Amino acid sequence: EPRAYPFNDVHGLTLAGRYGELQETEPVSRVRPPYGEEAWLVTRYEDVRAVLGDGRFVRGPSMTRDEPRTRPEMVKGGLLSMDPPEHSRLRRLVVKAFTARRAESLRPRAREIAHELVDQMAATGQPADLVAMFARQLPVRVICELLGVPSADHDRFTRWSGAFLSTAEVTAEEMQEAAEQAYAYMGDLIDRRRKEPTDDLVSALVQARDQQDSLSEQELLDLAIGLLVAGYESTTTQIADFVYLLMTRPELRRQLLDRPELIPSAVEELTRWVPLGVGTAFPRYAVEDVTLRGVTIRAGEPVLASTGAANRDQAQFPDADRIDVDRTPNQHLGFGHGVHHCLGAPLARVELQVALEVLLQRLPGIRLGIPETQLRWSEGMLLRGPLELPVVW
């Protein structure tokens, strides 16, 4: 009886037709994922939003449960495996340091970084791989700048960070060595910023307070590496997917060339439209029986709340499959919802807006250097995105 899940094909960004069918006829349904427990799948915008904001659906069981998932290993921990009130304390300290103003202040340095990466890419001649040379470089260098990793160390830090991408081809030994290097480096950096604070995020984390509460040494190190892995692969993959869309959809490209002031709205529209996850990814667990659209979800059972499907619900977004760069309103769930809503979103927005702005300004002719049908797509099974994007201009 449960349906085989995921439904999305990883070899492209199409939203599986099953989601729309289920939104009509079985909005709360049973799925059997490749690994982990069978689970409830929730597909309507209203219900996804409700699940992600409902106090009765928690993340703590992630720490021990056989979580519904697409890969054989379990990745657990960090802010996203915590529930209030433990979650609330850590999140309050982080956001006090990691402000929207701090994110906005990184725009000039993100633009300089993007310009340098295009310089480097263009110096390799055509076609050049936009994934290797740009998308996989900008977000980790911006996280370096955000944390306060000195310039001289961005290359080595970027190298270690590459080992944590779901697309990496590294042995267990190599990945272990990269993790050890990164945590040792970050622990040192924290220790130096406590002794001699600067204006960067690591210093602001060390000094964040709520009355007498503060982050411990171990919370600081875990949170800083947490920010890196949460803010790297997502952003990289979304850059790659957004430019893939601009290169393949002439009118979309034309509208942003002709009105670059549309880029921030376009970033929101493409965040809504792109079903970036292969599945849903972070199951919620009922703390008690809950009735959702007439179906009883029993205490303990996992629930997969599809933001990809929710963001394409025709009930919430008029003509939901059209990319309308000027769409208003646009209350999309592509940076989540409820207490776990993306705390890097302000920075992610600056990166994505800068990535489009600079690529379109420097390479307005940018296009696929190979037929679209020949693209190699990631089989990492977490996010959907091209493994390489050969581009010409």
Ligand X SMILES: CC[C@H]1OC(=O)/C=C/[C@H](C)[C@@H](O[C@@H]2O[C@H](C)C[C@H](N(C)C)[C@H]2O)[C@@H](C)C[C@@H](C)C(=O)/C=C/C=C/[C@@H]1CO[C@@H]1O[C@H](C)[C@@H](O)[C@@H](OC)[C@H]1OC
Q: How far is the CB of 241 from ligand HEM (least distance, A)?
A: 9
DSSP 294: T
- Report how far apart, in Å, the C-alpha atoms of 49 and of each of 52, 56, 333 are: 5, 13, 7
Q: What is the DSSP string of 124-141?
A: T-SSEEHIIIIITTHHHH
Chain CA centroid to CA 119, Å: 26
* The one among 91, 154, 337, 384 contacting Cl ion by CB under 5 A: 154
Q: How far is the CB of 173 from ligand HEM (least distance, A)?
A: 28
* The one among 234, 255, 311, 378 contacting ligand HEM by CB under 6 A: 234
Beta bridge partners of 368: 391
**Should residue 227 be labelled a site residue for ligand HEM when binding is judged by CB under 6 A?**
yes
* Residue 238: contacted member of ligand HEM, ligand X, Cl ion, none (CB under 5 to 8 Å, by partner type): ligand HEM
d(CA 203, CA 173): 32
Q: How far is the CB of 202 from ligand X (least distance, A)?
A: 16
Question: Quick one: 129 or 233, whose CB is closer to ligand X?
Answer: 233
* The one among 80, 132, 170, 370 contacting ligand HEM by CB under 6 A: 80
Alpha helices in the chain (DSSP H): 17-25, 45-53, 86-97, 100-105, 107-123, 130, 138-147, 154-162, 172-195, 201-207, 217-231, 233-248, 250-258, 263-273, 307-310, 345-362
* The one among 6, 27, 226, 279 contacting ligand HEM by CB under 6 A: 226
Q: How far is the CB of 197 from ligand X (least distance, A)?
A: 24
Chain CA centroid to CA 146, Å: 17
**Should residue 44 be labelled a site residue for Cl ion when binding is judged by CB under 5 A?**
no
| Tokens encoding 229 | 């892995």
d(CA 349, CA 224): 19
d(CA 39, CA 24): 19
**Should residue 238 be labelled a site residue for ligand HEM when binding is judged by CB under 6 A?**
yes
Alpha helices in 274-325 (DSSP H): 307-310
Instruction: Write b or e for each residue in 273-306: b if 16 or more Cβ atoms lie within 10 A of its Cβ, otherwise e.
Output: bbbbbbbbbbbbbbbeebebeeeebeeebbbbbb
Touching ligand HEM, residues 193-212 (CB under 6 A)? none
Q: How far is the CB of 252 from ligand HEM (least distance, A)?
A: 18
Site string for ligand HEM, 240-279 (x = CB under 6 A): ------------------------------------x---
Binding site for ligand X (CB under 6 A): 73, 75, 77-81, 164, 166, 168, 170, 172, 175, 179, 226, 229-230, 233, 382-383
Residues tagged in the binding site annotation:
77, 87, 91, 284, 340, 342
Residues tagged in the binding site annotation for heme:
87, 91, 284, 340, 342
Q: Which residues form the interface with Cl ion (CB under 5 A)?
A: 141, 154
Q: Which residues form the interface with ligand HEM (CB under 6 A)?
A: 79-80, 91, 226-227, 230-231, 234-235, 238, 276, 282, 334-336, 340, 342-344, 347-348
